[PDB]
Amino acid sequence: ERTWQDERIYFIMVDRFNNGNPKNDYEVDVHDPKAYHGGDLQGIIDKLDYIKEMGFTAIWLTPIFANEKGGYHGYWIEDFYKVEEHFGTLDDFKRLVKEAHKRDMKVILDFVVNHTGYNHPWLNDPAKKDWFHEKKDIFNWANQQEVENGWLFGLPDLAQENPEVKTYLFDVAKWWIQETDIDGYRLDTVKHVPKWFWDEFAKEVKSVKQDFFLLGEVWHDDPRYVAEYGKHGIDALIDFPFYKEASTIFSNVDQSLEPLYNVWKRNVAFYERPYLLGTFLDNHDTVRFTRLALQNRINPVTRLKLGLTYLFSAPGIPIMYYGTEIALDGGEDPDNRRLMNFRTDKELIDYVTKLGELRAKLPSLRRGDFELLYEKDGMALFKRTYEKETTVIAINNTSKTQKVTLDGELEQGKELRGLLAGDLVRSKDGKYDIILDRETAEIYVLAPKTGL
Ligand SMILES: [Ca+2]
Ligand SMILES: [Ca+2]
Ligand SMILES: [Ca+2]
Ligand SMILES: [Ca+2]
């Protein structure tokens, strides 16, 4: 039976994904990178089969709550109880969950507790002036109390210390769960809100749906700092240490994959739940991974194949940003948030589809241990075992044909059947001679010998 370790997440910025209703396009302007561009909830419903067909088992939507002007991303909330008018109606959103659930797919909403939009009405309500912390910037980022109390980017910082604010937040969190049947929240700006609040928050949402899933965003590349949050009722965290390594390493050839395995060992070290760490190559707050490839003047398609191979075969919960499967280019926000294009070449859509199939099929990729057998200068071999399954992930991130002989690391007299590109490596005298041509990848299941 299904666990969050088994999940593959397709991540969507609602506005930037699929304009499925042309009639809710209010002052949409696709030529202003800070306006609404037209994507909506109808948009997403129409693309459920496309998403599911790729092997994705869950969708994370950027926030859907009514936002003030310029809130095309959803993070400057104006009304916690209202669906953003450009996206749809509440009904449209209930139908979306229904449509995902029909497809066996889970729905995660982005959910914000830290702050309101800049022009939220409460800012004017005299009864609510103690709803907000004193307006101050964050200066010492090493002062965690300052980080929790400051107004990030000048965003009205909610005061969770006030029981009225806390209650309001729990009541909205519980409400969307009881009203729409979502499966989880991706928690924005986790690090700007105090830990004691997450414990209570955690208690409050799971009191309403027992398996309610929480994926927290703690923006930091120190797993020691990120891992603490996991101790406060948050089931999974976004793995920025993974991202920082994966992004850099897979965007150019002849770079060692070894740092990624140390991110693993450190995840085992520091987190209670090392498999429930959301892994990615990019997201809506980062430069597009394709732009890192373009910067290094190297073909982004071949970069993406290697990266996504590792993403889909390593521990954690893969989170592919909409667009990755078309080599969508994009610099810094907002330029990383381009309209999805559905009429491009399908090479990476089919490659991703194979990957998600293999991660579905091969419970060693969702649940197995994770061993580094070999790493030189980008040529890497990993091994993963689960019950009677043993899998071997080979990624040649080097500019040369590589041959690596395994000799005791696998049980002798079998063969490795390459399930990603059709390779075959037969034990010959205990040894497996793994040969990969430059910048290719393979995923092998270890299996009984065959022949003519
Ligand atoms: Ca629309
Ligand atoms: Ca609005
Ligand atoms: Ca705060
Ligand atoms: Ca080495």
Numbering used by the authors: 26 to 477
Paper text:
α-Amylases (EC 3.2.1.1) cleave α-1,4-glycosidic bonds of carbohydrates and oligosaccharides; Hence, these amylolytic enzymes are employed for industrial starch liquefaction and saccharification. GH13 family enzymes have three structural domains: (i) domain A, which forms an N-terminal (β/α)8 fold (TIM barrel) that functions as the catalytic domain; (ii) domain B, which is essential for substrate binding; and (iii) domain C, which forms a β-sandwich designated as a putative saccharide binding site6. Here, we present the first α-amylase structure from Anoxybacillus in the unaffiliated GH13 subfamily. The overall structure resembles previously solved structures of GH13 α-amylases13 and consists of three domains: catalytic domain A containing the active site within its TIM barrel fold (residues 26–139, 187–393), domain B (residues 140–186), and domain C with an all-β fold (residues 394–475).
To complement the understanding of enzyme conformations before and after substrate binding, we solved TASKA structures in the apo form and complexed with maltose or maltotriose. In the absence of a substrate or product, the structure of TASKA-Apo reveals that the active site of the enzyme is occupied by water and solvent molecules, whereas the structures of TASKA-M and TASKA-T show maltose bound to substrate-interacting subsites −1 and −2 of the substrate binding site with each subsite able to interact with one glucose subunit of maltose. Although GTA contains only two Ca2+ binding sites and shows high sequence identity to TASKA, we identified four Ca2+ ions (Ca1–4 in subsequent sections) in the TASKA-Apo, TASKA-M, and TASKA-T structures. Ca3 is coordinated by the side chains of E109 and E110, the main-chain oxygen atom of N92, and three water molecules in TASKA-Apo and TASKA-T, whereas this Ca2+ ion is coordinated by residues E109 and N92 and five water molecules in TASKA-M. Ca4 was coordinated by the main-chain oxygen atom of E400 and five water molecules (TASKA-Apo) or six water molecules (TASKA-M and TASKA-T), with one forming hydrogen bond interactions with conserved residues E283 and E400. Structural superposition of TASKA-Apo with TASKA-M and TASKA-T using protein backbone Cα atoms shows low RMSD values of 0.32 and 0.20 Å, respectively, indicating that the overall structure of TASKA does not undergo significant conformational changes upon maltose binding.
